[PDB]
Design a protein around this ligand. Structure first.
Ligand SMILES: COc1ccc(/C=C2\C(=O)Nc3ccc(N)cc32)cc1
Ligand SMILES: COc1ccc(/C=C2\C(=O)Nc3ccc(N)cc32)cc1
Lengths: 288, 288
């Protein structure tokens, strides 16, 4: 099938390969959907003398064809992508054991955990908050320019690297949209309902503009310091609440220009939402 | 889409509804893929005076359209099914809060945990082991007769109820095959690679005979007291090992007639595998 074809083409296929003997695995940093990520260290990694501390993405126990598919796809995507606000790939190990992707280690963990262990003024201004949002916007403008739809943009999918630098990660669900400017999935998707654009939920259509919708949910998360979207509202209720025109209220400690920006990422019509370029301009304005 | 249609038809739709006020939730029993299961107690449940201790299946945090789809489907399936070796449904709560399915509580937990906390002779004969396998076979013959393909048969998906009684659970991935005797999924499935039949892996075809293959993996698990299939072999290696005719070796403390039975559930050609009726006969033979 499509998968066995990919796996065999992959096993037959550069400068992405890394000796498994030079990689040492350590504690688990995170799990969840699709994979496991462990802290690691790599000896003589792409020109760097000695050890570099890295993160290693692998298949969890009992992986389905779907999670294997997502791992190989994330690898194919990350090889093409380069940007200061996108996670960096160093290589992979595929030869004498499990498939492992060697990626950039982020000193501060996920954006969601980073926010949750902090407070509004770890102390963080709303100027830091908006700075976070902005770095992500630039990241996203870049991937949009690459004709790439992330699909799974969320605080748990952004890493905080050294310097409090945002890195977009988790390219498992990302899809190329060069040809048609849309990705359409016939079956039910694996993105959390509460982050999906209204057209993705009802019609299974994903574009840069539905990434825009997720970005609005992610702003909400940033502003709330790691709150849970639509708190206390079950996911199945979202179909009707969204189509009947309902949206999350302005949270506490949110400025009107920020909430105004979220509201615009959640317009029903994908065309009436801003594009990442104009989002970034909006945030840079707010940040002064 | 197909999902919003189901959700609205469900919200518009008997004697399956249960007052949410009469249900009390308690500790988490299990999680993983698709849902969470919590211990609960239900007041005045389907004719039963007082409280009955039950299990409650719900959506985990941040559920995708896919997990919601699997929850509603499991509910639709469980309403049609009745057998001493299939989990019993009591009802659901859908009205004023999250969707919850109220099912049979199994005193001993999953078959996998039950086996792992035991020893060959908690002490268990190989006669108990084979008894477990047999109860599952009868369960499966019944669902096969209902023209139902389980798809996700595995020790973690069997519960051990009072009397050490096996109950097949987790009907999330189950599919009706009345019309065509097969279920075909175009996209990549969410069943663990190591439990899927060779035709399911390569061609995305599921039938009662690929359930037979999973049952062979499950026998292996029973015999090994909760071992991990294909230990130390990465899932992606399975395509080639399976198509080149490789199979798990006879494990320790396994009789030849038992291993002979697994080997037959793993024939390349779905037609050369036994049917559950003949599997059950084989096990009842062994059990003396
Ligand atoms: C201070 O605690 C930490 C917690 C999580 C991380 C996680 C990741 C990390 O460092 N790089 C990653 C790449 C992909 C994914 N999914 C996760 C990570 C790092 C540090
Ligand atoms: C002694 O420890 C226990 C551990 C898990 C259970 C789990 C379930 C249970 O009791 N009923 C269930 C129905 C569906 C699923 N997935 C799981 C369960 C019960 C008892």
């Amino acid at each position: 099938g499509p998968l066995s074809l990919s796996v065999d083409a992959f096993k037959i296929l550069p400068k992405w390969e890394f000796p498994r003997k030079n990689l040492v695995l350590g504690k688990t940093l995170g799990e969840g959907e699709f994979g496991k990520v462990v802290k690691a260290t790599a000896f003589h990694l792409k020109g760097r003398a000695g050890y570099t501390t890295v993160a290693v993405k692998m298949l969890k126990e009992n992986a389905s064809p779907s999670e294997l598919r997502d791992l190989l796809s994330e690898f194919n995507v990350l090889k093409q992508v380069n940007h200061p606000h996108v996670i960096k790939l160093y290589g992979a190990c595929s030869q004498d054991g499990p498939l492992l992707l060697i990626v950039e280690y982020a000193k501060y963990g996920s954006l969601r955990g980073f926010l949750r262990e902090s407070r509004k003024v770890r102390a963080l201004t709303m100027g830091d908050l908006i700075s976070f949002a902005w770095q992500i916007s630039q990241g996203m403008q870049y991937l949009a320019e690459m004709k790439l739809v992330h699909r799974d943009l969320a605080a748990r999918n952004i890493l905080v690297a050294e310097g409090r630098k945002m890195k977009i990660s988790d390219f498992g669900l990302s899809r190329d949209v060069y040809e048609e400017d849309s990705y359409v999935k016939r079956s039910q998707g694996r993105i959390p309902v509460k982050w999906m654009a209204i057209e993705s939920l009802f019609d299974h259509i994903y574009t840069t503009q539905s990434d825009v919708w997720s970005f609005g949910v992610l702003l909400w998360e940033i502003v709330t310091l790691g709150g849970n979207p639509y708190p206390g509202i079950p996911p199945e209720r979202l179909f009707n609440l969204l189509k009947t025109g309902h949206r999350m209220e302005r949270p506490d400690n949110c400025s009107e220009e920020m909430y105004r920006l979220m509201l615009q990422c959640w317009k029903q019509e994908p065309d009436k939402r801003p594009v990442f370029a104009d989002i970034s301009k909006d945030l840079e304005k707010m940040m002064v």
